Amino acid sequence: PAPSANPAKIFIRRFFSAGVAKNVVSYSNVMAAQRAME
Amino acid sequence: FFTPQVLALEVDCNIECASLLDLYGQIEVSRSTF
Numbered sequence A: 001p002a003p004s005a006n007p008a009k010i011f012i013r014r015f016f017s018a019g020v021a022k023n024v025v026s027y028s029n030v031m032a033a034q035r036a037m038e
Numbered sequence B: 001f002f003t004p005q006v007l008a009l010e011v012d013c014n015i016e017c018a019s020l021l022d023l024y025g026q027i028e029v030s031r032s033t034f
Helices: A027-035
Strands: none
Touching: none
């Protein structure tokens, strides 16, 4: 079944960096959604 | 007329130093001047 080999390694090569625990959304997006509730 | 047997070894001897980039705190960032 599962081959564990996706073509999504194109980013972890250098475009991303492993083991960093990056946040999922930009802080600008958070505050934008914040002020948009008022 | 005599063709040498090209063996498949490649020597190197080139220490990097050692890794020291995993101790520091890691924070991914965005457009500069945070």
